[PDB]
Amino acid sequence: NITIFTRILDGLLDGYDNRLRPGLGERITQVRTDMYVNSFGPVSDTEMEYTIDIFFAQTWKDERLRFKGPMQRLPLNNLLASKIWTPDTFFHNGKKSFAHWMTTPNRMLRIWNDGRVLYTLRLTISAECPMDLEDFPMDEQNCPLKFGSYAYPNSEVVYVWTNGSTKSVVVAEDGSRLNQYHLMGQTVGTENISTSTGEYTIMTAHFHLKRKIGYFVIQTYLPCIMTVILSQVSFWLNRESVAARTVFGVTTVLTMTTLSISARNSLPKVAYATAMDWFIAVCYAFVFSALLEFAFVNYITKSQPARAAKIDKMSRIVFPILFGTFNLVYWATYLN
Amino acid sequence: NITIFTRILDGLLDGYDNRLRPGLGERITQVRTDMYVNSFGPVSDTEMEYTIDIFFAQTWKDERLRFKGPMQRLPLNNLLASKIWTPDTFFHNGKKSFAHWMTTPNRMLRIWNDGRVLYTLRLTISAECPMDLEDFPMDEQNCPLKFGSYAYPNSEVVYVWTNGSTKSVVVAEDGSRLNQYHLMGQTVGTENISTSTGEYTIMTAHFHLKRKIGYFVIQTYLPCIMTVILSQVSFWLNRESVAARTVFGVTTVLTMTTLSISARNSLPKVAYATAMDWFIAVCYAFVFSALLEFAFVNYITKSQPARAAKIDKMSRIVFPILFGTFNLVYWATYLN
Amino acid sequence: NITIFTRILDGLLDGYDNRLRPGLGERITQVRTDMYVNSFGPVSDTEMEYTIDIFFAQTWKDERLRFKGPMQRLPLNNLLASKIWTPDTFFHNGKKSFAHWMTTPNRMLRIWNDGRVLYTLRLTISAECPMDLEDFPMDEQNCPLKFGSYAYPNSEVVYVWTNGSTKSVVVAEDGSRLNQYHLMGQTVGTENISTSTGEYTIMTAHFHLKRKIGYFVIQTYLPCIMTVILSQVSFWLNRESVAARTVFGVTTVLTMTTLSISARNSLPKVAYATAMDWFIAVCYAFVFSALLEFAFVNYITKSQPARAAKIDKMSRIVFPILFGTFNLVYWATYLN
Amino acid sequence: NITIFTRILDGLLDGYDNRLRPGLGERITQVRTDMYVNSFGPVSDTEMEYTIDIFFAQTWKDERLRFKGPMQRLPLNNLLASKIWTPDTFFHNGKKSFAHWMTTPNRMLRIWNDGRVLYTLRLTISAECPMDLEDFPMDEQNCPLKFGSYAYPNSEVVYVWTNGSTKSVVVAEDGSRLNQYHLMGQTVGTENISTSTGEYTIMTAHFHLKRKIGYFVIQTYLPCIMTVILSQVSFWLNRESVAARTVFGVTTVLTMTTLSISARNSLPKVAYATAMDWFIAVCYAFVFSALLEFAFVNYITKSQPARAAKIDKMSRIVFPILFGTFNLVYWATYLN
Amino acid sequence: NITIFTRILDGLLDGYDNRLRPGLGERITQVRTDMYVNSFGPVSDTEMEYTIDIFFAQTWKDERLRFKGPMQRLPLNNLLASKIWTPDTFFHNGKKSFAHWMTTPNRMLRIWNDGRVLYTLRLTISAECPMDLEDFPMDEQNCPLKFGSYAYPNSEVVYVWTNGSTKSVVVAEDGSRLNQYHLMGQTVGTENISTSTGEYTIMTAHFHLKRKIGYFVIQTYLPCIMTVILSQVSFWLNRESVAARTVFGVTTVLTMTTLSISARNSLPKVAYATAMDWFIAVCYAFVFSALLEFAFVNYITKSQPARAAKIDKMSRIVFPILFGTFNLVYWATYLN
Ligand SMILES: CCC[C@@H](CO)NC(=O)c1ccc(OCc2c(-c3ccc(C)nc3)noc2C)nc1
Ligand SMILES: CCC[C@@H](CO)NC(=O)c1ccc(OCc2c(-c3ccc(C)nc3)noc2C)nc1
Ligand SMILES: CCC[C@@H](CO)NC(=O)c1ccc(OCc2c(-c3ccc(C)nc3)noc2C)nc1
Ligand SMILES: CCC[C@@H](CO)NC(=O)c1ccc(OCc2c(-c3ccc(C)nc3)noc2C)nc1
Ligand SMILES: CCC[C@@H](CO)NC(=O)c1ccc(OCc2c(-c3ccc(C)nc3)noc2C)nc1
Ligand SMILES: *[C@@H]1O[C@H](CO)[C@@H](O)[C@H](O)[C@H]1NC(C)=O
Ligand SMILES: *[C@@H]1O[C@H](CO)[C@@H](O)[C@H](O)[C@H]1NC(C)=O
Ligand SMILES: *[C@@H]1O[C@H](CO)[C@@H](O)[C@H](O)[C@H]1NC(C)=O
Ligand SMILES: *[C@@H]1O[C@H](CO)[C@@H](O)[C@H](O)[C@H]1NC(C)=O
Ligand SMILES: *[C@@H]1O[C@H](CO)[C@@H](O)[C@H](O)[C@H]1NC(C)=O
Predict the structure, then answer these.
(1) CB distance from D2 to chain E under 8 Å?
(2) Which end of chain C has fewer CB atoms at under 10 Å, N or C?
(3) Does the beta carbon of E18 lie inside 6 Å of ligand 10?
(4) How many CA atoms does the CB half-sphere of D19 hold within 13 Å?
(5) Same domain, residue pair B246 and B200
(6) Subunits that touch chain C (at least 3 Cβ pairs < 8 angstroms)?
(7) In whole angstroms, what is the distance from residue E68 CA to residue E306 CA?
(8) Residues of chain E neighbouring C86 (CB-CB closer than 8 A)
(9) Residue A192 C-alpha to ligand 6 middle, in angstroms?
(10) Is D187 in the E-facing interface, judged by CB distances under 8 Å?
(11) Domain finish residue from A210, A239, A257
(12) What CATH number should be reported for the domain holding residue B64?
């Protein structure tokens, strides 16, 4: 009984040219694309790339594959894929894309009586995501994903998303788990580009990323905040204890310097100032300013001791207030 | 005499279509899966992936391979594997799976008279293991391993473990050796998933991991514990030695700060607090608090020396008791 | 109707030898090359290599492919590419070049009635860019890209850019985005080389790179500048405070030493002095010189206190002026 | 004249089934294995793997290859290897094995009149070497290398070393050069294993490794030894110099702490104590104990100065003696 | 007209056995090898390997390829290479060699009427270069490159360099550019080796490398030299300033300790002392010795102040002289 299916396959392959698209010189081929993101890979700020794994699916029409039989569907595998025509889809921004092979090549091929074809493929894309780290770490990123035909212009092959946007792109709940980002949502789009070879249709999908704060708070912000508090303790000490107050100022200044170097080692080498850098610089001024205050006080502690005492007492109140006020402005500005 | 076997192989291949599963349109194919873990690979917390090497085996039925001969078994190699039908099994969570080739492709194919087939394969799977580092390092992890068909729905191919759970999955004694984890045990499971293409059967296996403590004790906990003890020595010193007591407080505070930075460099960049972080913070307060005590004492050592002496004497007893009490609560809470 | 195209393809392949170039022993083949840079990859100073992704296109003439039909163009794919003759172009300086495969091999093949052929290919080139870091970081680099034939001498195959230089090489606006470089412009060139096998034609394209400053200012220059200012504070302190002034000098000298080590860790291991190194050395002298001044002052503070006071007062003015003057000369020299 | 050899090859291939082993269902095939280690690769303690390059050779018997001709030997290449039957040998513990291809596949195939076959292959094996770092760095390791058949049980194929053990395994003098290990010698062995598929024969070869000390002496031991000596200098100083003696104790304690962290960064993350760790801990006690002695002395220098002087004088002698005695016990225990 | 060439190719392939070398059982094949180094890759001391890219060329004789035609040369490509016999050359010391593919396999095949064949190939070799770092960094290295036949003994195939040594090996001027080495020159050689399979001919080429100093001077030597000078400043200070002189000695000793650790991190883990290590040790003694001098002086400053002053004055002169004298001996010894 199974032999009937074998005859059908041979008939379709008879007089079949895999090098010619269906409806050549007669109409325009239409392709429907749907995507499912199995898991969203890590985002590397240093390399400006993000990995992703998807089940890419493409649907089109082919009159040459019409067949008649008891079954309306013919599940198959990659064996027959190489014997027919498939679109030459590729990713413009994909630096390096590799497929999955074991245990068996992850591909499917389904054919119906009307000729409709469903071809699906599993891929891993190491695309590139340009970013503007001006409000880092309070930054929102829009990592795109562009793909389209390579050799078939817009006058022969057209890519259109199937059904609505939500059905076109699906993201698994467990996949959207990044250590330092939130997957707020997804969007889709289309456009045309004109080149020497002709016009092409481009399908674009964007993923909205919102960085989650909390790692940098425990790593960079808190050490800077506590370092400033340490310096202010020198004010409460007596003036005559020159050595004691000197240690506080010198050690704190060096501590701030090394934090800036270590903090930016992980951050990408960007030739502009970030929000974190401004925060570090302000904290650097406080510790440095406190050291200057001690030097000025110790330089006039003999001629006019009266003014020195007033300055030292005043500093115990002025400096904490300014630091507290600055934090409210800084956090409010970037968090609202 | 050997020529008899050659004729048998040709007969089976005659009229054989590798693109059609056995019993198509007549019944539902059943596949029995058994696994053996040669060695459990390292677990990378930063990349949330774990490597594993297994001898994957699949058994099914094929009536087209029936044969009659003196021998009930026909040991073979990968040469005949490509000439017949095999399931398109794949791992849903496998980021990158590669097979082993040298010296000869590690595959076997055995056929019996009844048509039963035993196909085995050697694989290395770089799967992903999501984790919740809320009780780190006292954390228990459940790294899964999911696999199933790609193109054949649940109505055509069904995966069922053979015999009991213990026989289905076997782990070598030498393989279960990880530098920073314990392989407490294994479990298996099954479930169905409905998608656009149809329903599929999913076979799930979980490995229980219990982190072994002792590396972090020698790396993070002890330096923090000894640092606190160092600070308390300042209390036993005389008040007039302002410079001496200052060095203890300043150096210890900086030492704690760098330990936090270095400790989390190896730990994954997670935007939430761990148990280790709370322990570090508490130890940071003690050293910082001791420095504040000295400043307060030195600020009133002239007007009311009587109260200063009482505070210094009391601090020698209060602080050690609190630190000792805290450790009992902390360790007891997470170890019981 | 489509069957007409199938017959045409078979006719061209009849009596076609892919191992023989067109017009063998009759004339000289001419090839026109055009390039489009999709994205300019990162530049690794340590490895002296730069990555790049391009759409390489080659045009030539083949009389054997003449055909007559309703359509003047025959869009195709990589399937027919292997069945005809293509040039053996290669990159002389390309350390490791790999192509892109998924989803379908990124190649196109177009044929016209006259025999003109348009073959395009997508490549990623990890070429090598020698550099002279004598004015680092104020350095301008000229990273080339050389390619040509491997087996066909200049007497058989000649490479010539099509149209003008601007049309020959095109760089996408978004692609020319490097974290630490500016793509000032592009240039092209040609030349011949004589070897044992014979003369060959070499096509050379150069990319002008101008390093963008600002990362090193926040990383190396500022810490050195602030460190010098810290040392000068010791002058304003009193001579009798021997311990206080000692701490400033000792700590600052060590701080400068570690900055030099850390700064050059990222920089390539080059056995010659850079502009940054000279700046560090000068700053090292100031902090070291200040320490020497204190030692000299403290060594004569008993016999002739009168001269010691004059030296200390003078140092408060001389040193800042010299440091300010040096910066103007240094920055002006390399920035103009 | 050469045409005679061509006819011989065709005759052997006639009626040859590469899927059936020689003497099937008649006897048991016997295979002789010999190995030559071109170079022993680096040993990675962190990854518990060792690389090795060998010229694997296998000899067996095949009656179907009998031939008659003037020459008793037929040197050949990999071209004929794929056309005959070869054993499916594989390495059980080989995580990832890759062969060498350029310039030409490194394989040989020699056939004699009697049917004896000599098949050799070049391989690189990234095997795994479990270790017990309890006596680190004075540890001796036994890295094995296991290989055997995959599909052919012990009842069909048997592996036996040829000639004696010394001839079976050969190691080049230049190859046995490791930066931090000594190749004391080699050993071989055999055993059987019973599994579901049946019994198999396992050939095991062990390499004895003796770690060479001297890198850790210059890296970890000496800094700890010199640090202890530095602390003892504080004893010779006067009691009234509270600040001076404080610096020695505080700085040394911190120095020991960082050495422990840095030392174990290269060492694998093992959750148990090593010999080096105990040595560090003992040295940590000395520096810490010296600081405690100063605090105790300074705490009674007023009420009973007489006892303080005796303690300080005694400490100058007791501490050096204990440190010297400890080293003799420690080194003698692990070196003998 | 071109059809004549097509007929010639078919005639040569007729009755051609690619598995049999020319002149089998009649004479000894002779192969001429010439090399051109496009670029000399980086040398990794840690991994004891060096990368290199070459255009390997081999010339031999084949009577079966004789042809008659108007053209004395037949330029071709890799298409015909697989259809004839080529030597199985390989590199004995090549850990991992890979070829270049894009755009087209970099291979050429030229045939003359007499049968002479010119086969060339482009390769990248990651060979191993053992080194003896006893005089590091003033060390001269001899990195070899060995290659020869795999299956053809010395009685069948012999490798001989063509023309003189200079013509045999050619190095491009731009290629011989290493960041930390000088390519002084090249040499060639030959030898025979006897093994179980028989005698073989080995072709050896050595590259002379002379390390260029200047990176270590700016990285390791200068910080050590300046650190010693810093310690000597303590001598010029007054004895009563116990705290001041203590800081100089303690900080400098720790600074030297960390330089040794950091310096050897990049250096390979070798279990023996280098020249740099001895220089560091000597500098360590000076700073340590100066600290001992202060302790001895402060220990007798009460009983016999007269002798203390003489020691302090003398130390200001003795120590600088010894350090200067040592440098002359050290540099002269290794630089001459
Ligand atoms: C992600 C959007 C990228 C857009 C806008 O920035 N780039 C362009 O504007 C553009 C792209 C290609 C091009 O042609 C290069 C070429 C091709 C060729 C091949 C296949 C395809 C599909 N397109 C072109 N064949 O030869 C040559 C030479 N010219 C301009
Ligand atoms: C590890 C459990 C993962 C579960 C639950 O989280 N994911 C889903 O719920 C799910 C999976 C696939 C899917 O379809 C995508 C698809 C397929 C296709 C191909 C092969 C297979 C076997 N399944 C689907 N072909 O085209 C498209 C488009 N939709 C939803
Ligand atoms: C980027 C410019 C590089 C220039 C200038 O520095 N190099 C040379 O001057 C040069 C290059 C090759 C050569 O021949 C080596 C050779 C070849 C062979 C193969 C294919 C081609 C295309 N050329 C040569 N076949 O065998 C052997 C031996 N000799 C000198
Ligand atoms: C290095 C020594 C390792 C020893 C002792 O620790 N391991 C075992 O005891 C062991 C090994 C395999 C096994 O079977 C798994 C299997 C196989 C299969 C395939 C090929 C071969 C050659 N053996 C088994 N085919 O399907 C399944 C399922 N069971 C137990
Ligand atoms: C770079 C110089 C290396 C020299 C000197 O140190 N080594 C030796 O002395 C030596 C090399 C091979 C050998 O044989 C191993 C072997 C081979 C085989 C295959 C192909 C070739 C060309 N040679 C041998 N086939 O099976 C087996 C077993 N024995 C000793
Ligand atoms: C792209 O081209 C198609 C041609 O049919 C056209 O319908 C569509 O509107 C174009 N899109 C844009 C954004 O211009
Ligand atoms: C999955 O589907 C099969 C269909 O036969 C059914 O027997 C089984 O109970 C289902 N499993 C679950 C968990 O629903
Ligand atoms: C290279 O050779 C060609 C041969 O036609 C010649 O026309 C051209 O001028 C040569 N180029 C140079 C730079 O010599
Ligand atoms: C392994 O099996 C073979 C079967 O012939 C037997 O001769 C041999 O003694 C066995 N080895 C061991 C260690 O039991
Ligand atoms: C190597 O063998 C050949 C055999 O012809 C011989 O001529 C040559 O002298 C030998 N070389 C050495 C170094 O012995």
Answers:
(1) yes
(2) C
(3) no
(4) 19
(5) no
(6) A, E
(7) 107
(8) 104
(9) 6
(10) no
(11) A210
(12) 2.70.170.10
Indicate whether E58 and E123 sit together in one domain: yes
Residue A48: name the closest of A132, A137, A124 by CA. Answer: A132
Tokens of A126: 């190491």
- Ligand 4 pocket member D304 (CB < 6 A): no
Per DSSP, chain C holds a count of helices (H) and strands (E) of: 7, 11
DSSP-derived pairing of the beta strands D29-44 and D157-161: parallel
Closest-CA distance of chain D to residue B198, Å: 36
Q: How many domains, in total, are found in chain E? A: 2
The set of protein residues with a Cβ atom below 6 angstroms from ligand 9 is: D 154, 191-192
What is the radius of gyration, based on Cα positions, of chain B?
Answer: 32
Q: Which pairs count as long-range contacts for C322-326, CB under 8 Å and 24+ apart, including other chains?
A: C322/C286, C323/C228, C323/C286, C326/C282
Dump strand ranges (E) for A12-115.
29-44, 49-61, 89-91, 94-99, 107-111
Contacting B residues, span 33-92, partner chain A, CB-CB under 8 Å = 47, 56, 86-90, 92
Distance, in Å, from the CA atom of C209 to the CA atom of C141, rounded to the nearest integer, reads 5
Token readout for B4 is: 């008899």
**Binding site membership of E30 for ligand 10 (Cβ less than 6 Å):** no
Q: Tell me, rounded to whole angstroms, the distance of Cα A179 from its chain centroid.
A: 12
* Minimal Cβ distance to C97: which of E38, E100, E179: E100
Q: Which of E238, E74, E157 is nearest to C239 (CA)?
A: E238
**CB contact E226 to C (< 8 Å):** yes
DSSP state string for C15-31: T--TTS-TTTTTS-EEE
Q: Which residues of D touch B6 (CB under 8 A)?
A: 17, 20
Q: What's the DSSP call for residue C219?
A: I
d(CA B162, CA B155): 20
Last residue of a domain, one of C195, C210, C225: C210
- Do residues A130 and A248 both lie within one domain? no
Q: Residues B283, B302: one domain?
A: yes
**d(Cα C336, Cα C75) in Å, to the nearest integer?**
54
Query: What phi-psi label fits residue A155: left (phi over 0), alpha (psi between -120 and 50 degrees) or beta?
Result: alpha
For C225, which DSSP code? H
CATH of the domain at C253: 1.20.58.390
Judged by CB atoms closer than 8 Å, whether chains meet at D277 and B218 is answered as yes
Question: What's the N-to-C CA distance of chain E in angstroms?
Answer: 71
Could you tell me if C231 and C148 lie in one domain? no
Taking only residues 141 to 160 of chain B, the set having a beta carbon closer than 8 angstroms to any beta carbon of chain A reads 150-152, 156
Strand ranges inside chain A, DSSP E: 29-44, 49-61, 89-91, 94-99, 107-111, 116-128, 140-149, 157-161, 169-171, 182-194, 199-210
Does residue C215 sit in helix, strand or coil?
helix
- Non-local (6+) Cβ contacts of B70 within 8 A are B4, D25
Q: Is D55 in the pocket of ligand 5 (CB under 6 A)?
A: yes
E51 and E192 fall within a common domain: yes
Q: Residue E122 in contact with residue E53, Cβ under 8 Å?
A: yes
For residues B148 and B270, state if they share a domain.
no
Do E204 and E297 lie in one domain? The reply is no
- Domain containing C43 equals 3-210
Distance of alpha carbon E227 from alpha carbon E280, whole angstroms: 11
Burial (CB count <10 Å: 0-12, 13-18, 19+), residue B113 = middle
Cβ–Cβ gap E151/D77 under 8 Å: yes
Is residue C150 in contact with ligand 3, taking CB distance under 6 Å?
Answer: yes
Residue keyed to tokens 């490194």: D106
